[PDB]
Paper text:
The cryo-EM structural models of Ftn-2X-2 and Ftn-2x-3 and these two Ftns with CuCl2 supplement were solved and revealed two detailed metal binding environments. Instate of binding metal, either Fe(II) or Cu(II), at the C2 interface of Ftn-2x-2, 63BtA, 67BtA, and H60 form an aromatic cluster of pi–pi interactions. Conversion rates (CVRs) carried out by Ftn-1x-3 and Ftn-2x-2 with 2 equiv of DEEM were 20% and 33%, respectively, making the latter more desirable for further characterization. For Ftn-2x-2, seven other α,β-unsaturated reagents were tested to modify insulin, yielding CVRs between 0 and 44%. To investigate Ftn-2x-2’s substrate scope as an aza-Michael ligase, we examined its catalytic activity alongside DEEM treatment on seven additional protein substrates that ranged in length from 10 to 607 residues: a luteinizing hormone-releasing hormone analog ([d-Ala6, N-Me-Leu7]-LH-RH), the small ubiquitin-related modifier 1 (SUMO1), lysozyme, human ubiquitin conjugating enzymes UBE2 V2 and UBE2N, superfolder green fluorescent protein (sfGFP), and bovine serum albumin (BSA).
Author numbering:
A (entry chain V), B (entry chain A), C (entry chain D), D (entry chain F): 5 to 176
Amino acid sequence: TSQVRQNYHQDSEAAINRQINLELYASYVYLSMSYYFDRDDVALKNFAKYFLHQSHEEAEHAAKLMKLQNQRGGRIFLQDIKKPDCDDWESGLNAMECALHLEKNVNQSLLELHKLATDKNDPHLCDFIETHYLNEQVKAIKELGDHVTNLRKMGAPESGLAEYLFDKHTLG
Amino acid sequence: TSQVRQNYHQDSEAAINRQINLELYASYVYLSMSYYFDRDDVALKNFAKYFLHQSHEEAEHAAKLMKLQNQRGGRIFLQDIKKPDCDDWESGLNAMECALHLEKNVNQSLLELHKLATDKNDPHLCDFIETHYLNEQVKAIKELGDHVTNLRKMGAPESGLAEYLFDKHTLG
Amino acid sequence: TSQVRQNYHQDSEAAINRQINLELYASYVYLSMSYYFDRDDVALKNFAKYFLHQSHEEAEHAAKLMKLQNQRGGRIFLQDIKKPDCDDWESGLNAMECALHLEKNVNQSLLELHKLATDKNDPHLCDFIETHYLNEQVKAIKELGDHVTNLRKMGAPESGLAEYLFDKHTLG
Amino acid sequence: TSQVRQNYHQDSEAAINRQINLELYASYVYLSMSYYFDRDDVALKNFAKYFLHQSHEEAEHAAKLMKLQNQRGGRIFLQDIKKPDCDDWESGLNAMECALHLEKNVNQSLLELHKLATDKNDPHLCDFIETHYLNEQVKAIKELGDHVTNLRKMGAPESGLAEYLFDKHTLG
Ligand code: NA
Ligand code: NA
Ligand code: NA
Ligand code: NA
């Protein structure tokens, strides 16, 4: 119906809406993590800062998807942003592992979206995904994997000194 | 249980958690409005910009509340961020009226929170609310009322020229 | 025959030549529009400026396609640039609607070109189209749709005041 | 009797004098801690610097209270500044825990002062306490709690390496 809509399948529109909700959910998870590390009984300031930055970045990814939805003449349908799985993330290492799992889940969703766009012969949508989301996800996954490896090698979560020093030296 | 907790009632902690969720919900409503005005069949760029700025400000208010929760030794319990009431906000004037209603609802919640903090003799929480939330809410309500008045006087929503010119001159 | 030619199908070469001609035709249409709004009995300077800028941009798109043709070892075959459909474009709103229709036609041609390049397994040509043409077209279509929406809402073409104010505030 | 005195109860004046003495005592405790960490057999320079800064800040808080006493027409009655409980503070972690306990005691005194001022309907005194003392105390308590948490997690006081690294990385 939109005067600008061209080569934009309804399935693609629906998938974009689902991706918007997933990105908002990921941002909310990161927010929860960030303020977990701000707790007085956790007190890892750079973990909190790292996850807060991640949250803001995820928010921006969601917003970019909404912008695309409008650009292509699709209609944004928002849904509830579900609360994260955990209130207490239990350690820096556990939070990093959960973030890695989350980023891989988002990446899988993006790959499914790219598959759909390819099936619908929507080169603009494919190129948008590749340009703005896929390599960002690969880099994020690599960085989180590096963090997890380093934390495990340093002796986290059992060694509190490990998480303290990782907070200072890697995230600081 | 928190080593930093002092003169922080459990009722106040719960009310702060509810306020956090309300602020996140308000931010989400503003986001929905912003991207409604970004639609090709609405195309009011400065309305979109205004509501996007409002959304970011609300997000920051929520985050400040979470920071307080941690500062006082309370524990943040996040909840689902419900989707906004509307997908289609129908006009600049209607969006402004809905935003006014929303801001007054948030203000009423903040006033109830202040009443609770006064009843619990929590001067720090009272002062926090007064310093960071109450006057901001009064100013926001006044600004939205001004916008609604001007839009109505110009002939919105029936006159599209009114909303166009208000977009340019007041929000631009 | 070209020493540089590699994985460049003759069908792709022919389609590129057709695209070159289409881009030149679009530039010529925009030129006609621009100088229509420069007429003393139309006198919408920023409409003229907008369409002149569009014309120059289209010319540059054509030239970029010719550069690609040479880069890949294809041979440029120019054809007559047909005159635009209209000498008199009748209004700012009508010109914007015609420009929207034209941009969607160019976009459809580009999508067909991308389909051909995908069928011929020419990833370089696909990537060229995606990187330099597809998102530019989506943005142009969105912008024109916004202009059309705003002009219609303001009361164009009947209200001359609408086109005057749109000339000043949006295109100025 | 003072020409400037207005709505300043004698009970409030006495409580302000007691608060002045408490702030001076806290400054003296911090001074003792600071020079404990300057000992050659302790030798934690940034612990010493941190506690010296805390001492100076407490002194300034006391002085601000005296200024208020004069502003409101009360009369300053100084009392002996009692020596701190300990000469030897035994470790960085123990000093931080004692500082946390001290700050919470000062905060409790300030809250009692605010309760008194509210009971006497002295909004100026209430606002003074809220503006200059309450949030400062909350922040100080939160910071000390964070320090205590980090020191405990790193393995202090048993691990001298923990206190050394905390000295360098957090307090440095
Ligand atoms: Na993302
Ligand atoms: Na708010
Ligand atoms: Na073009
Ligand atoms: Na003090």
